[PDB]
Design a protein around this ligand. Sequence first.
Ligand SMILES: *[C@H]1O[C@H](CO)[C@H](O)[C@H](O[C@H]2O[C@H](CO)[C@H](O)[C@H](O)[C@H]2NC(C)=O)[C@H]1NC(C)=O
Ligand SMILES: *[C@H]1O[C@H](CO)[C@H](O)[C@H](O[C@H]2O[C@H](CO)[C@H](O)[C@H](O)[C@H]2NC(C)=O)[C@H]1NC(C)=O
Ligand SMILES: *[C@H]1O[C@H](CO)[C@H](O)[C@H](O)[C@H]1NC(C)=O
Ligand SMILES: *[C@H]1O[C@H](CO)[C@H](O)[C@H](O)[C@H]1NC(C)=O
Lengths: 63, 63
Amino acid sequence: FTLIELLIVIAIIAILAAVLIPNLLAARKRANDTVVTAYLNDAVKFQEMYQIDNNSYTSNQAA
Amino acid sequence: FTLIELLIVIAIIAILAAVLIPNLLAARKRANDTVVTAYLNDAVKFQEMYQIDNNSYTSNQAA
Ligand SMILES: *[C@H]1O[C@H](CO)[C@H](O)[C@H](O[C@H]2O[C@H](CO)[C@H](O)[C@H](O)[C@H]2NC(C)=O)[C@H]1NC(C)=O
Ligand SMILES: *[C@H]1O[C@H](CO)[C@H](O)[C@H](O[C@H]2O[C@H](CO)[C@H](O)[C@H](O)[C@H]2NC(C)=O)[C@H]1NC(C)=O
Ligand SMILES: *[C@H]1O[C@H](CO)[C@H](O)[C@H](O)[C@H]1NC(C)=O
Ligand SMILES: *[C@H]1O[C@H](CO)[C@H](O)[C@H](O)[C@H]1NC(C)=O
């Protein structure tokens, strides 16, 4: 094992470190939109439950 | 064995001593950039772990 093999190893590490890491921001954006969609789907279920009890929809989240 | 053979030996030692030693600074530069790259790749893993626990990224290294 010699300095030229070790420079090749360092060079290839620099390549793999650059390319094998995903765009984390783009991944989290799509997960975050799923949270919003899921929370609105829940708010919709609870608007219908409030409608069962009160014959009207809520304007306030605490209800 | 005589003074002329010994002067040839000294002359060739002076040559091999000059050429067979690598640029140590250049080698260490590329290893040092690997340390920085590796430490930032770790800091990135830990930013995602802090995001798992806190729903936000850290601004401070101690976290
Ligand atoms: C939903 O609650 C809102 C505050 O959280 C706000 O009060 C909205 O307006 C209502 O005001 C009172 C109830 O607080 C009234 O008797 C009616 O429910 C309603 N008034 C008007 C102007 O409609 C309430 N819902 C909405 C958007 O009307
Ligand atoms: C990360 O910690 C920093 C100090 O280590 C600094 O405090 C940054 O600013 C925050 O300040 C407090 C927390 O200490 C706030 O409640 C917020 O988390 C944040 N303030 C602002 C202005 O955003 C903190 N993160 C960053 C860069 O916001
Ligand atoms: C929801 O009900 C709780 C009690 O069960 C509190 O009265 C709260 O204020 C209610 N939310 C609103 C404001 O409608
Ligand atoms: C990390 O946690 C340790 C305890 O496990 C200390 O509270 C330390 O201060 C923390 N770092 C910061 C400042 O977030």
